[PDB]
Amino acid sequence: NVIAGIERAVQDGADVMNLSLGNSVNNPDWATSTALDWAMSEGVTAVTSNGNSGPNNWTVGSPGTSREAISVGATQLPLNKSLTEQMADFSSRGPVMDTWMIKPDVSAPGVNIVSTIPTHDPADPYGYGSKQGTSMASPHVAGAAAVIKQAKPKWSPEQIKAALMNTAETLTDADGDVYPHNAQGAGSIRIMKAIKADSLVAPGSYSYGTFMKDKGNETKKETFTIENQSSIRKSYQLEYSFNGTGITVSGTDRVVIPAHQTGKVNAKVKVNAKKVKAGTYEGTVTVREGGKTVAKVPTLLIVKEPDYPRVTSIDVQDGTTQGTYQIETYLPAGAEELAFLVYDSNLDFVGQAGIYKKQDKGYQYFDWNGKVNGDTALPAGEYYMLAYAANKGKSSQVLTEKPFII
Amino acid sequence: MDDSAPYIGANDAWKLGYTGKGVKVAIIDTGVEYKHPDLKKNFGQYKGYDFVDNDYDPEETPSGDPRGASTDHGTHVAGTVAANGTIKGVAPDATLLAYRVLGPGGSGTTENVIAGIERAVQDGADVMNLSLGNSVNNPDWATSTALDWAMSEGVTAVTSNGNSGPNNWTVGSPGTSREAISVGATQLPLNKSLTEQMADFSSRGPVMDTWMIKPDVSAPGVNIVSTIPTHDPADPYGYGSKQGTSMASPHVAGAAAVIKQAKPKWSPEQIKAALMNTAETLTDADGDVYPHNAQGAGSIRIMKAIKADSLVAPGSYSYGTFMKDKGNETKKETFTIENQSSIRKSYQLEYSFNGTGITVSGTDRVVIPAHQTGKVNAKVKVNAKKVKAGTYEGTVTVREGGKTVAKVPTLLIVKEPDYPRVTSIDVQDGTTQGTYQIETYLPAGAEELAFLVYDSNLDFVGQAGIYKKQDKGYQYFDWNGKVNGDTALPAGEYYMLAYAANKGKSSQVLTEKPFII
Amino acid sequence: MDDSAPYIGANDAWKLGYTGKGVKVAIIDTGVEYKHPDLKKNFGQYKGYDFVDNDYDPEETPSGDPRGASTDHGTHVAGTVAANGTIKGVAPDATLLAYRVLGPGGSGTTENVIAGIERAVQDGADVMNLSLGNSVNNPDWATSTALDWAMSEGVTAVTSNGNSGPNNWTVGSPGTSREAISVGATQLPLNKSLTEQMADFSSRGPVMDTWMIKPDVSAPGVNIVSTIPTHDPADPYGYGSKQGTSMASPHVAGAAAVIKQAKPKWSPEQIKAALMNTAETLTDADGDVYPHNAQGAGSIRIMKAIKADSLVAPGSYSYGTFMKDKGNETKKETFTIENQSSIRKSYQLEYSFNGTGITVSGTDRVVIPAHQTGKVNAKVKVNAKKVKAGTYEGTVTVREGGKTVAKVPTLLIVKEPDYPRVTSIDVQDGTTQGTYQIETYLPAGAEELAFLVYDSNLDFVGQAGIYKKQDKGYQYFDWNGKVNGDTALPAGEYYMLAYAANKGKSSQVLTEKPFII
């Protein structure tokens, strides 16, 4: 139904599309993400929510993992020790699995938003209500995209995404530290700055992927594109930075672009495997032009294996045969070892449901005969199951909410 | 038949209503006893044909036949495919046709098998089962050409891989066909409890001259109980347990019948790709994945195959041989993904190869609209300076929205393949008394060929003959019975060893059934 | 008759004044009770002829006739065509003529039907209705030749397609004529509410040896209420509901009468082209268009046919068979568009065919002056290397200034058509006591023909006879009652199965009404 809705919205000539739905599978190639990438190529800007998950990396939702779509996180407006803008602690956080893309793309006000609702009361069916969620940060960006498209009728959907993402205010938390890139994206939108922008840097954010070399130096490079929308030949100045030691960044320090033309800047990153601690490092490419800053491109690279949750979700349902069960789990990148353990209603370790090795990534299904540690039948009651997955030198676990009944 | 069918997923398909109703399965074997109570209602009015006798009564060979011995292979195969009653076949609603092409003793002319295949295509059979086969690793045998003629006249063809010990390049003749599902045999998980394991009598690929991966799929084929004729007038019908690669194929034939009932629009190649795509890889006792030319793609899973909206074809690909002495050689293949669903999907490709000096690349992602087709260009590159000669197995894995939709087994060979240089040798009496004829089969010719003679105690008596630059195929040599030149053998019983050397490797084969001087 | 006539558009034509006045319709059936109050005033002074009795009283067969059973088919057909009163026929102003050619029991000699057709042409009948027919798919049957003789002596001929289950190549003998409107039966939209649907007893084409698309048109023929004789002296006239393809044709006969009143200058072929051109395609329950040899061109629409200034002829075309093993084969047809209007028009052609390897082209646009005729050259090309054998359905669509003026169903067959190799078999007692005669019908001969015998329990007793290289048509074989050669049957009741194999396909047919040994 969501794919049909997206396609029918493309049919009906919609210029901007808003998706405040989404599941919690960190997969860039979900069906809803492929459909969203089909648009944004049929000239339709697509704005989607990042998802509603607590402060935790690798929790971005399925439609909000699409490669070409503006994913929006939620922020709190400056409230009185007076605080500045702050990201809400329920916005899903990137990166995206299997592409390591920085998400959310942009953040917008999404906490305590009052707007029109139906009261579902025949006496007075219309009213106003205050709702909160990442699903209500995206409508701000959808309205911003509509305004920009009215202002700049020739911009492509990717140009609008680059203009929103380029002119965005970085957010600092209470202590005074800049929020991580996979909590902010590029900052809060500023419609006025985006509307008055004669230079576009694309892609608005880039991810260098992973560096897996055990020894030696590994070099990667990216080509950013600067479009000089003005009528005057300009000179753009590039400053590359990365946090963390052992990462050296270089590239084109200056370009000159004629009027109504396009230039290419070759950013280059080099990681010394002998000096760099494994982890996720955030960099930035800053583009300056005649005073003002025209863009601040968030970059990101990962060293060794990313620290994604090895197992994301687990649920237990009744099997086709009475007395047996089916365990469905999601492994983002497979599992060298997978274990299902059973806990009583008091969360006391009853025993070990199952052991498995060398599991393929994606959705995995296992039949469980309801017997623990082998040949030991459970007493009747209410139980929880814990999935423990170990892969590539890290292990994760997830507990079944909504306990199943024996 | 009460444990293998649950394993492959037959019962689960039955509860979905898919039992093979309306599908017609032909059994080209020694004939079928179409009066077993478990087989009575699956046979229509016209039961089939009997080519070894030229009558419309395809009954099995009775007991006490001058030309040979009584047979029960065909009835067992038919019960495995579709038996309704005490024993339930894989597709216990399919119509059956019997074609007696193998005479008494289980031996049949190639012309009879070709006639049986063509007549089964005539009679509208949708699925065809061949549990016969010789042991010539030739993809262009007559029975293989006939099997490739079908699978193009809309008839799925399932054949056994053959019954030869654990050894590469031993796949049989009909099971070497380019377009036919060849089935290997597996052992069901038995209690240190073991998982599924391939039997050690299944023939193993690759196919000669095409280097194709065979078997195509494996299926349970060890200790299969099914309907047999007892050849006893007191009670002519019973049940018996037989084992062999010839009894793994009926499971896949029943699976194909069930799928054809479930998916009535699929072509024979689409069914082959669906069985081959959704198959569970098998690991041996220690924990190592069985080689591709011992497994094909794993054991069938009828339930996964029935519920499949994406088909990757061909289900397995072979890049052939890389013969360059120096430099880098690049080959490429185009796999085809059919998106049978109603929603535009994105497929993700992972290419891997074992062995060093082999670099694999290609299209890492495709987007296919609904009810359409996309192409992925896999590419392999071999550095001749770094790669040790041998056979290397790779894999193309296709993922779509979570689940894995296919795991395509790929294979390439570096330098010359290590096939047996000589396959079979036999010695018969010549047209002239006192002389002999030696008939041997050389899969790719022989730079040098030598026939040596051994006594009954396997002591080297001497050297029968030497030959050079022999053409491939069947070779015949006249031997005057004299050893080392002009030395006549003493009377007795002798064995002959053929030693063939070709392209830097040598092989030998000994004549069983010793000949008499 | 109160729901089908509104559906086909009879009432709308009536309000335009077109009710069939002056048109004469002949009903060649079991006779008509020309005293039903609904039929009394539609019969002129001379009611018709009675060929089974040779008198001028074409009354239906009375109750209690030694030669057979009482009949009511003809009266029902006549009420459907033109009944004025409580039930209103399609053309409730047409004169009627009754021709009793089918004797008691509904069976009649072919010579009587030919005589009835010729006498109906004598008597000046403008429309002719044949709701009879055997089940021989032969376009050159005597009744079909007689029907093609009319439609050239200015007499429109409407016939039933026949009553055979959903199966291709089952169209009856008079309904295989090259020039006659053959009608299939449809179910009216009934409440998941369904649209119009073809009944599953209508015979389906194509015609043998001409591959013509049949039925030509479909019409409501399920649950039709109309005038019947009750065969009760207390009240001899009543109404009854009958179903069958034989009752779809009267709707088209009434439609032809109405059109002939509306367009007095149209030839019988022009009326056929006008009915066939303006017809609504029917989709089944799932949503797929019914095949052309199940629909013809769709259901009639009298109102659209009456208001039509452009006629495309022939209304449907068949390209025959493409037998080339390799290469490309091209065929072409010339359709004719008659511009009956007073204004020069431009017609636009769209050609389509289902299936791959078939490329269709031709004249994409013609301009025809007023009251003139243009020719469009449709052309089909089949690539033998890419096309799977089978029957493919195409369409030529003609558009003119907005509205669509025609949708010509086309059809071609690749390689050998999949007709039943053997159609009918019966066994009668021979001239010599103890022997039998087997009469079978082979539509195109048989490379091999086998007669097999089954007991009353349908258990294969043995093989009656084997024959090779049989000529097409009716074949007769003497059988000595002995099975498998020299083995005499035990006394009892037996069935016989004819298995015919020809040109790479085999068919079988079982004798109903078992014969007695």
Residue numbers in the entry:
A (entry chain A): 269 to 348, 477 to 802
B (entry chain B), C (entry chain M): 158 to 348, 477 to 802
Paper text:
Vpr proteins fold into four domains: a catalytic domain containing the typical catalytic triad of serine protease, an insert domain visible only in the cryo-EM map with a low threshold, and two assembly domains mainly responsible for inter-subunit interactions. Vpr proteins assemble into fibrils with a helical symmetry and a C2 symmetry. The fibrils are held together by two sets of inter-subunit interactions, one between subunit n and n+1 and the other between subunit n and n-2′ (the C2 symmetry counterpart of n-2). These inter-subunit interactions are predominantly hydrophilic, including hydrogen bonds and salt bridges, but there are also hydrophobic interactions. The relative position of the catalytic triad (Asp186, His230, and Ser531) suggests that the active site of Vpr protein is well folded and may be in a functional conformation. The active site in each subunit of Vpr fibrils is located in a cleft on the surface of the fibrils and is accessible to the solvent. There is an inner tunnel of ~23 Å in width at the center of Vpr fibrils, and extra densities are found inside the tunnel. The shape of the extra densities is a straight tube with an approximately circular cross-section, and the diameter of the circular cross-section is ~15 Å. These extra densities may suggest binding of unknown ligands, which should be negatively charged, as multiple lysine residues surround these densities (blue arrows).
In this study, we use cryo-EM to identify protein fibrils surrounding lab-cultured Bacillus amyloiquefaciens and discover an unreported fibril species in addition to the flagellar fibrils. In summary, our study identified two protein fibrils outside Bacillus bacteria: the extensively studied flagella and the previously undiscovered Vpr fibrils.
